[PDB]
Amino acid sequence: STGSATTTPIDSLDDAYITPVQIGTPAQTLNLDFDTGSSDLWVFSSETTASEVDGQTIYTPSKSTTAKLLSGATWSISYGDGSSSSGDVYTDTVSVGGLTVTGQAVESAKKVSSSFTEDSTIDGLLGLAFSTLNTVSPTQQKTFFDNAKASLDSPVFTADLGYHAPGTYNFGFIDTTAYTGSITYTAVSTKQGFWEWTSTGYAVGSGTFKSTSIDGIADTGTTLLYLPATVVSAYWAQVSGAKSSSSVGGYVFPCSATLPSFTFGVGSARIVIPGDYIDFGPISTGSSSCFGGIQSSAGIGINIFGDVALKAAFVVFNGATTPTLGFASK
Numbered sequence: 367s368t369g370s371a372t373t374t375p376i377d378s379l380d381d382a383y384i385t386p387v388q389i390g391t392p393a394q395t396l397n398l399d400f401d402t403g404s405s406d407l408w409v410f411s412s413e414t415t416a417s418e419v420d421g422q423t424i425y426t427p428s429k430s431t432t433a434k435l436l437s438g439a440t441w442s443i444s445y446g447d448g449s450s451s452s453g454d455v456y457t458d459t460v461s462v463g464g465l466t467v468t469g470q471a472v473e474s475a476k477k478v479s480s481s482f483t484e485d486s487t488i489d490g491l492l493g494l495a496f497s498t499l500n501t502v503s504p505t506q507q508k509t510f511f512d513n514a515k516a517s518l519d520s521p522v523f524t525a526d527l528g529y530h531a532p533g534t535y536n537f538g539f540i541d542t543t544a545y546t547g548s549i550t551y552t553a554v555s556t557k558q559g560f561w562e563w564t565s566t567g568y569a570v571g572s573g574t575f576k577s578t579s580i581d582g583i584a585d586t587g588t589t590l591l592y593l594p595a596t597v598v599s600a601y602w603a604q605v606s607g608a609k610s611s612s613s614v615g616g617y618v619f620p621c622s623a624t625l626p627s628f629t630f631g632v633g634s635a636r637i638v639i640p641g642d643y644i645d646f647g648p649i650s651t652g653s654s655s656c657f658g659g660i661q662s663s664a665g666i667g668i669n670i671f672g673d674v675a676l677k678a679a680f681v682v683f684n685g686a687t688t689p690t691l692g693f694a695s696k
Contacts, residue, residue, distance in 0.1 A: 367517045368538035369465025373400065373527065376487040379646050380673060381589050383527060384487060385535055388461040389472055390430030396423050396489035400535055401587030402525065402561055402683060403670070405499035405509050406443050407460070408451055408473035409490035410482075418478050421486030427474060433458045441473045441501045446588070446666065451478040455502055460510060462492075465537050467514050471500075471507035491587065494523065494683065499559035511537070511685060521685045525586055526696070527677035529643055545680035545694035550635035554689040558668075560585070561683060563691050565671075566633060568593075570601050571626030575636070582669030584676060584683070584691055590646070591628070591639070591674040592663035601628060601660050608658070614649050617658040621648065628660060630675060632693040639678040 373385040384397035389409065396409055410419060412426040427433040433456045442452035453476035460470040475490070482488070493500070497508045515521045518538030526544055527533040534544070555562045560583040569575040580593065598617065602608040604626050608619035619625070625641030644659035659674040682692030 369463040370536045371463030372532050374532045390458045391432040398490050398492040399488050401491045402494040403585035403587045405493040405495045407492045411474040414475045418483045420483050423489045427456045443501045449479045449481040451475045496556050496559045523683050525681045545696040549692040549694040550632045551690045551692045566631030569629040570604050582671050585670050588670045588672030590672050591660045592670040595662040595664045598662045616661040618655045621656040637679045
């Protein structure tokens with residue numbers, strides 16, 4: 367089997383991407399944030415505290431004939447950006463772009479933190495990291511991809527995120543028309559539950575390539591590119607007027623400035639992030655100060671190849687017995 371779904375930016379800055387997901391019988395369609403940095407499929411629901419729902423579409427298990435309470439199961443998650451949610455668990459039928467899993471753990475939110483409430487466009491998350499990170503207790507649950515894997519034509523999914531435009535998540539096949547050149551594959555460590563790999567270095571604009579190992583994660587659920595402070599400093603030093611602002615929480619730059627590209631290494635191959643991808647617009651309406659899309663990972667404790675990086679590539683998440691990651695230009 368295979369599946370193919372369009373993923374759409376939630377706003378004009380590509381702050382995140384939502385993908386429609388069918389849950390239950392008859393189908394309830396929710397727009398989920400596909401997140402290769404976490405491993406819980408959780409949704410706004412009929413059980414979510416009413417005061418914490420503001421415009422989201424909810425899953426109502428009682429209206430699904432295939433929904434079954436996973437008795438005794440609870441979940442509770444906290445994300446790197448300080449947000450959180452928690453609740454109980456049902457199993458139900460979940461379909462993504464034609465691909466159907468039965469008995470998928472659908473984690474129903476009883477509580478969500480304010481940032482989720484305040485984002486009316488995201489109805490939940492669908493985690494695509496390794497199932498070892500799943501928070502369901504007492505019995506850890508498998509991700510949608512893990513459950514689908516054996517049925518797929520090939521044990522892979524791909525992320526093709528658009529710049530200011532829709533893109534595609536595919537399951538079970540590699541669309542050879544979706545990228546240019548060849549796919550370069552690189553080793554993955556699953557020891558922290560992430561799609562963790564080691565970039566071979568970077569360049570800033572037309573600068574020479576610096577060969578240096580950068581361990582990080584391929585994370586569709588993180589907006590920006592978070593790299594070591596040395597690297598980030600070298601980038602923003604090439605932007606006139608750029609500065610790091612504690613009050614704003616990172617590097618900002620005059621909206622009148624031209625951003626250089628940023629290149630990262632995948633083995634001997636190179637992915638080029640165009641400068642425009644690194645512009646996240648005015649820090650506040652009317653401000654001439656723009657927020658940068660490359661920021662320091664210092665104090666996150668991990669480097670994160672978020673959407674800024676991934677949307678410059680066609681990315682293969684190869685869930686073979688020994689997982690690997692593939693990157694192609696597009």
